[PDB]
Each structure stands twice: as structure tokens, then as C-alpha cells.
Amino acid sequence: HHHHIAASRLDEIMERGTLRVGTTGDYKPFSYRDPDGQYTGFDIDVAKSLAKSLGVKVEFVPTTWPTLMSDLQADKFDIAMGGVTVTPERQKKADFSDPYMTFGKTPLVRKEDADKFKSLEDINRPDVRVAVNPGGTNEKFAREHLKKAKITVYENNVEIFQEVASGRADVMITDTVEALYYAKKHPGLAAVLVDKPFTHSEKGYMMPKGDQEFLNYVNQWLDQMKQQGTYEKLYEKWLKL
Ligand code: NA
């Protein structure tokens, strides 16, 4: 409320004049170090834009994966921003923003086929040569959701991405991170982000439990950020999408 009674974390931040952002600095492309050992990445950029929305300075507080949750609970920083995946273990002890990225499996295809394979429907066709490694989630995704396609099983150390590029297969199913990396590093390949059933996880900003005020601010701000195209530019800049 305004005819209000209480001070919130959102007030503490405004009164102190700094947003303390917990981040690991060991995770490209979200949070890492440039050639000088300053913070760089996707969520370093976002962090700065959140501080600026608030009218405050950003202060980056080093944390590590092993102490992320206890640092957050011990009020070392106001928010964790650093490609944090939303996991049940993490939600037990923290609140998450709405998701700013979804991920899981991502098809990797030739560059000129990018527009051609953009849905499950486009991919699950009998002329489509699908490539996977044996024995894990890539193979199981294909057997489950791509039954009309011609699925070939390779081996884990084979360069399957290169089978796609050279035209010996059409679509490689792999984790998002790998798709994105092979597409960025090969001029002939493109990664196409598709929603369910391909996506199975999400990334969010992690906040201490019980302050709906800051969390609501963040969520309104994320949505504003989506709406004006800022996440698109970030995807482009950092994910080379
Ligand atoms: Na590429």
C-alpha cells in the first residue's frame, strides 16, 4: 500500500542506492569475466538494466554454485542473476521471477533449413533424417516425439553436427546449450528454438522468499523488457540467435 505501514526489501534497495546482484562469473554466456576480469554476459547486461530501472547503482556480489542458496538466504545480495535454472531444490528456498528463457532440447539444422524446421510438425516427417547419440534423452526424445522421421543412432563421440552440415542428416537433437554452440561456431548450421515438447526447463532470477513487492516489480519489469524487444537483442547478441 501507499497509506502504507511497512518497509520492504524494495525500499531498502532504494534507500541504500544500490542493487546487490549475486552472480558466479563462471558461466558463459550469462556471467563471466572479460579480458580484464570485469563481469560480462547476458545477465550482467540485464542486471544493469534492472538497476537503472530502479534508479540505483548495480553492485555485483561474487557467489559460487555451492554457496548460492545459503548466500541468498543470509542476505548477501538482493537477487541472483546468472543463468540460474529453476529447479525444485532451488524453489524450496527461494522465489523465482517469471522465466526469461526456456530451454531443453533444440534442433540443430542447416542454415538454409532454419525457416523450414520450426515446429515439431515440420520435423516429425518421414523424409526428415534425424540424428541422435545412443542411450540418453536425445534418443528418447526422438523415439517419443519424432516417430515419423528417419532416426539414425550414432555414438556419443561422433561429430553428429557435421553430419547435419555436410547434408548426411537433416536435424540433430541435442541439449539447447550444445545446439547453440555448434550453430554459433559453424557458418552452415543454425539452432532453432522450439517450445514444448522440446523445452523442459527455464531460467529465472532468484530472490529471497517472502518479498512479493520486489518480486512483482521484477516481473513487471521483465514483461516490459520483453515487450520492447530488449530480450530479443540480448538473444541475438549473446546467443547468436
Ligand atoms: Na551458424
Side-chain angles (χ1 to χ4, degrees), residues 1-11 13-56 58-241:
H1 265 253
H2 175 270
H3 52 261
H4 70 284
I5 57 181
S8 59
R9 312 198 63 274
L10 187 62
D11 292 305
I13 295 156
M14 269 150 209
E15 301 177 29
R16 178 177 61 250
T18 299
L19 176 67
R20 306 172 305 148
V21 175
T23 203
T24 63
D26 66 9
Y27 185 21
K28 307 155 131 68
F30 297 99
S31 179
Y32 59 107
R33 309 308 198 127
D34 68 22
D36 309 294
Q38 296 314 111
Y39 285 103
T40 184
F42 185 114
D43 285 324
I44 304 300
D45 286 0
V46 175
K48 290 175 174 170
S49 165
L50 180 54
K52 176 181 199 268
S53 178
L54 290 164
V56 304
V58 70
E59 175 190 335
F60 288 109
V61 176
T63 189
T64 70
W65 298 95
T67 56
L68 180 64
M69 298 313 308
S70 58
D71 288 352
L72 179 63
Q73 281 169 265
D75 190 29
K76 263 53 211 296
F77 41 75
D78 298 305
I79 181 166
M81 297 178 84
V84 183
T85 300
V86 182
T87 64
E89 148 198 287
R90 285 163 181 167
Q91 290 166 294
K92 275 167 59 159
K93 306 135 190 289
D95 279 331
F96 277 96
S97 76
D98 296 329
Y100 61 95
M101 193 182 293
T102 55
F103 72 97
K105 304 302 185 187
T106 293
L108 175 76
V109 301
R110 291 180 289 282
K111 161 94 112 63
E112 72 268 28
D113 281 357
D115 55 326
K116 159 179 193 184
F117 293 118
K118 34 163 179 275
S119 62
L120 181 66
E121 294 55 41
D122 287 358
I123 296 159
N124 189 32
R125 300 293 190 70
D127 29 79
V128 178
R129 292 163 310 166
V130 173
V132 300
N133 58 309
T137 51
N138 298 323
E139 173 171 21
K140 173 209 222 315
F141 180 93
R143 295 200 185 288
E144 173 169 358
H145 298 283
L146 305 171
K147 292 190 160 89
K148 299 160 192 219
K150 190 176 310 99
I151 292 181
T152 300
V153 183
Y154 293 73
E155 291 295 338
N156 292 344
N157 217 34
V158 162
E159 302 188 312
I160 302 167
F161 69 92
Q162 189 52 54
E163 298 302 302
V164 174
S166 61
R168 295 182 298 267
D170 294 317
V171 178
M172 174 185 175
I173 304 298
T174 187
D175 292 332
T176 300
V177 71
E178 293 182 44
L180 293 175
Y181 177 88
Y182 299 131
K184 73 174 172 152
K185 285 202 150 167
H186 197 304
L189 300 176
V192 187
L193 297 179
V194 183
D195 305 323
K196 307 295 210 155
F198 288 82
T199 58
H200 57 54
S201 308
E202 65 190 40
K203 305 293 193 180
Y205 306 120
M206 212 175 45
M207 279 165 283
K209 273 184 143 62
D211 201 272
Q212 280 338 74
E213 202 169 83
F214 189 30
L215 169 81
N216 286 352
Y217 190 103
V218 176
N219 284 341
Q220 288 155 356
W221 177 71
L222 279 181
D223 167 84
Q224 166 171 276
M225 209 77 154
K226 281 155 222 214
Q227 281 289 104
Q228 79 217 345
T230 318
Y231 274 99
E232 280 168 35
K233 263 86 135 190
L234 290 177
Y235 273 44
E236 177 175 298
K237 176 181 180 191
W238 295 103
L239 304 190
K240 307 289 151 177
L241 261 5

